[PDB]
């Protein structure tokens, strides 16, 4: 069974270096061409580098000079030396086996994540989002939760510990300034809240954070 497993990905400061590895199984590097391909946060796929079964190496000019691909045929391990790293280099890296002059990327590994950033482990700021008096005059009510400035990703947000599951929209985290910010919204019947308790539970494993924020109606 062909298998490709990427390792080495992780947090790295800009201009820094990182070595990524890729242990292969089910085949020999002397019989297949290998490549590294990355998917950026924006989901854009980018060819990083490749090495033919014969050892020939190719890089696009953007990676040329900064990254270096090599392989251990005996131990069947593909490598990717990364240096002069930049935030654009932040992506999921996949090693891929292809069939010589047939298919470039026939088989992909699940990938290893490389995050280039100067940020330091920062716990998030969790704030309860209560409705304005003009939005609470209907049959339903939407509540929210703002999880601001944390690092690194990710955080785990739930409502009433997961008790509150339907009508929820937890939005993808975005960079506010080398730090992540996320928000979640939950919509329930007006008779559900404030009549019944609703709490936002946010955890941030990297900072050993686990905070709870109960949404309280506004007003003096």
């Amino acid at each position: 069974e062909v298998k490709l497993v990427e390792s080495g990905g992780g947090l790295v400061k800009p201009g820094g270096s990182l070595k990524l590895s890729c242990a292969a199984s089910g085949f020999s590097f002397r019989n297949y061409g290998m490549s590294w391909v990355r998917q950026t946060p924006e989901k854009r796929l980018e060819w990083v580098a490749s090495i033919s079964y014969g050892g020939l190496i190719y890089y696009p000019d953007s990676i040329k000079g900064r990254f270096t691909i090599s392989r251990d045929i005996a131990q069947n391990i593909l490598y990717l030396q990364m240096s002069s790293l930049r935030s654009e280099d932040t992506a999921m890296y996949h090693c891929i086996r292809g069939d010589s002059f047939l298919v470039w990327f026939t088989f992909w590994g699940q990938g290893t994540l490389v995050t280039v950033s100067a940020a330091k482990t920062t716990a998030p700021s969790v704030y309860p989002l209560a409705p304005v008096c003009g939005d609470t005059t209907g049959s339903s009510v939407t509540l929210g939760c703002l999880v601001k400035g944390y690092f690194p990703e990710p955080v785990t947000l739930t409502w009433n510990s997961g008790s509150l599951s339907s009508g929820v929209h937890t939005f993808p985290a975005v960079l506010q300034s080398d730090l992540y910010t996320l928000s979640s919204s939950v919509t329930v019947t007006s008779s559900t809240w404030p009549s019944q308790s609703i709490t936002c539970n946010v955890a941030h494993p990297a900072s050993s954070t686990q905070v709870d924020k109960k949404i309280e109606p506004r007003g003096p």
Binding site: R44, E46, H94, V132, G134, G144, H169, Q176
Partner: protein, 219 residues
Amino acid sequence: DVLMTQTPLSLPVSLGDQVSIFCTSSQTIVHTNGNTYLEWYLQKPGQSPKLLIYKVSNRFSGVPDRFSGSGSGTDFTLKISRVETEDLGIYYCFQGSHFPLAFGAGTKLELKRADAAPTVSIFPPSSEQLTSGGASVVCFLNNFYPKDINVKWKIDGSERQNGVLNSWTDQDSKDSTYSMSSTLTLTKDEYERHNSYTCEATHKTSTSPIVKSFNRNEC
């Protein structure tokens, strides 16, 4: 270099539908050995990309008979004869006939459904954040369809294009709609320098924007 251009970036479909996704190369892509290394990949949410078609029209072993590839010159096409729920995700084309090898931006296969006006909710800074000296004004434009939407902020009547962070959810797996959050981040002092905060959503369902707002002192 050869650039690959995919269209559309979003293809709303109904199950059972016959579909065609396109990929355009900035120039001809024939390897000196005569082969055309045009490949098609499908990446399912949460998974790595998987090969569908190689060398323009060769369906990869194990890939369903409903997928097929074709094209010539600078025009290439991926076809799905009868779309299934499992086919949903993003399709990518790739050219490897000339270096540097290049990928297309991708086409997202999404589900069609009835138009849906967004439910707009505005939330003034929390007292907790205010206390720490911050002022985030959030707005949610939820469960709308189609996915295309514009959000405009106004502070004391004047538009605020600066200092806004937006995020979008993927199509809801339950009602197939879309949601988006918009956060205007200010400072405690800045926020206290104005009274009216408005969030306006422009959806193909409204033209005349859905408007939601509050006053720092009154509701």
